[PDB]
Design a protein around this ligand. Structure first.
Ligand SMILES: CCCCCCCCCCC
Ligand SMILES: CCCCCCCCCCC
Ligand SMILES: CCCCCCCC
Ligand SMILES: CCCCCCCC
Ligand SMILES: CCCCCCCC
Ligand SMILES: [K+]
Ligand SMILES: [K+]
Ligand SMILES: [K+]
Ligand SMILES: [K+]
Ligand SMILES: [K+]
Ligand SMILES: [K+]
Lengths: 262, 255
C-alpha cells in the first residue's frame, strides 16, 4: 500500500487547504455581514419599542410574532395566491432533481417529504443523464463554431487554445450570465448585482433562496438546464487551473528549498 | 440524438412529480392559510386599537425581518454550505461586498472542494475495498452473483453509518421527528439543502460538517449506482419494446 500512503498524504494536504480556505472565507464573511447584522437588529429593537409605547393596548406581541414566524415556515387580500399550484409544484420538482433546492417552497406533509426523498434519489441521477447529454450536445455545437474560428487564426497549435477558451468564456458569459440576468432585472425588479448574484447561485447549483425568479417561467427552467451545463464546463476549467497552479507552486517551493539561500 | 428522448422523460417525470406534490401539499396549504385568516381577524376583533390600519404595517416589517448569526462559527458553516453547493439559505449575505465575495468564493471554493471530496471518496472507497475483499472470499469457497451480495452490504452498512445514526443524533439533539431527521439527512447529503431543517437553526457543529463531508461522498456513490440501474432498466425496457414491436407484427404478416 505504498501509493495508498502517497494518496492519503495528498488528501490530507488538500484537506488542510480547504480548512484554511474556509477559515479565510469565514473571517471575510463575518467581517462583511456582522456590521449590517447589528445595524439591522438594533433598528428592529427600535421598531419594537416604537410599536409598544405607541400602542400600549404585551408579552403577547411576542406570541403574534411567534405565529408570524410560524407563518414564515409556510410563506386587504384575505384571499392569497397559491404556492403549490399547477406550476410551482413543477418548478419545485425542478429544484429537487437539479439539487438546487431554493427552499422557498418545501414539503410539510410527511408523505410529501417521503415522496421528495424517493423523488430525489431517482430524479437526481435521471437528470444527470439529461444534463450530460445537453452538455455533450452543446459542447459539440461549440466544437463546430470553434473549429471555424481557429483555422482563421492558424496564420502555433499551442497558443491558439488560449484565444479559444477566452472566446468560450466570453460568449458563454454573455449568453448564459449577462443576458438572462438583465432579463431578470427587468422582470423580477432586481439590482444589477442581485441578478448576476442569482445567476451564479442558481447555476452553481447552490441555491440559497434569498432570490428566486406564463412564458417567463418555462424559459427560466430551460435556461437553468443549459446554464448548468455551462458552469459545469466553467467549474471544470477552473479545477484544471487550480491543478496547474497547485503543481507549479509545488515546483516553485521545490525550487526555493533546494536553492534555500544559494 | 437520444438527448431529446431523455428530455421528454425528464419533462414527464417533472409533470408526474408536479401533480403528486400539489396533491400532497395544497390541502395543507389551504388549511394553514384559512387558519391564518382566522388568527388575523381574531387579533383584529380582540384589539379595537390594534385596528386594521396598524397591522399590515407591522407584518411587512416582520417579514422584512424574515429577510434577516454571523458569529465566529456560523460564518464558517456558511462558507461550508457555499463550497459544498448545499446553500441552506438560513444565513445569506446582505452586504453588496459579501455577495460579490460569495460569488468569487464559490467559483473558487466549489472546484477546490471537489478535489477534497474526490480524495475523501477515493479514500473511503478503498477502505471498503479492503473490507469487501475480506467478506467476499468467505462467500467464494462456500460468483457474478457475489457482486450483488456485495452492493447490498455496501448500501446497508452505509445507510446505517451515514443515514441512520446521524439522523438519530439529530433527533435527540435538534429535537426533530423520526422523519424530519432522515429528511434532513437526504436533503443535505443530496446537496439539495432547502433550509426548512438545518442543524444550525461546540462538540456538535464540527462533527456535523465532517459528517457532511464524508456523507456527500457516500451519496455520490449511491446516486452513481442508481444512475447505473436506470441505465440498465432503460436499456432493458428498450429491448422489451423491440420485443413487443417485432412480435406485435410477426403476427401482422399472417394474412
Ligand atoms: C420514517 C419512515 C421513512 C421512510 C423512508 C422510506 C424511503 C424509501 C426509499 C425508496 C427508494
Ligand atoms: C419508478 C420506476 C421507473 C424509474 C424510471 C424508469 C426510466 C426508464 C427510462 C426509459 C428510457
Ligand atoms: C490561500 C493560499 C493557501 C496556500 C496554502 C499553502 C500550502 C502550499
Ligand atoms: C416510469 C415512468 C415513465 C415511463 C416511460 C417509459 C419509457 C418510454
Ligand atoms: C461586479 C462583479 C463582477 C464579477 C466578478 C468576477 C470575478 C472573477
Ligand atoms: K453537484
Ligand atoms: K439550496
Ligand atoms: K448542489
Ligand atoms: K429563508
Ligand atoms: K443546493
Ligand atoms: K436553500
Amino acid at each position: 500500500s505504498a501509493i495508498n500512503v502517497m494518496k492519503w498524504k495528498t488528501v490530507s494536504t488538500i484537506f488542510l487547504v480547504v480548512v484554511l480556505y474556509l477559515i479565510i472565507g469565514a473571517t471575510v464573511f463575518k467581517a462583511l455581514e456582522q456590521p449590517q447584522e447589528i445595524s439591522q437588529r438594533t433598528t428592529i429593537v427600535i421598531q419594537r419599542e416604537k410599536f409598544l409605547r405607541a400602542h400600549p393596548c404585551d408579552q403577547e406581541l411576542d406570541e403574534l410574532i411567534q405565529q408570524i414566524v410560524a407563518a414564515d415556515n409556510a410563506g386587504a387580500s384575505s384571499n392569497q395566491v397559491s404556492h403549490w399550484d399547477l406550476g410551482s409544484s413543477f418548478f419545485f420538482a425542478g429544484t429537487v432533481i437539479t439539487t438546487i433546492g431554493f427552499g422557498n417552497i418545501s414539503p410539510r406533509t410527511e408523505g410529501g417529504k417521503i415522496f421528495c426523498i424517493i423523488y430525489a434519489l431517482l430524479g437526481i441521477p435521471l437528470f444527470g443523464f439529461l444534463l450530460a447529454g445537453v452538455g455533450d450536445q452543446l459542447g459539440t455545437i461549440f466544437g463546430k463554431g470553434i473549429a471555424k474560428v481557429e483555422d482563421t487564426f492558424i496564420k502555433s497549435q499551442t497558443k491558439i487554445r488560449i484565444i479559444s477558451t477566452i472566446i468560450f468564456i466570453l460568449f458563454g458569459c454573455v449568453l448564459f450570465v449577462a443576458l438572462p440576468a438583465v432579463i431578470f432585472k427587468h422582470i423580477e425588479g432586481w439590482s444589477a448585482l442581485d441578478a448576476i448574484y442569482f445567476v451564479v447561485i442558481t447555476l452553481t447549483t447552490i441555491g440559497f433562496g434569498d432570490y428566486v425568479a406564463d412564458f417567463y417561467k418555462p424559459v427560466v427552467w430551460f435556461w437553468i438546464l443549459v446554464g448548468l451545463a455551462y458552469f459545469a464546463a466553467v467549474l471544470s476549467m477552473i479545477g484544471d487551473w487550480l491543478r496547474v497552479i497547485a503543481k507549479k507552486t509545488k515546483e516553485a517551493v521545490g525550487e526555493f528549498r533546494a536553492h534555500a539561500a544559494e
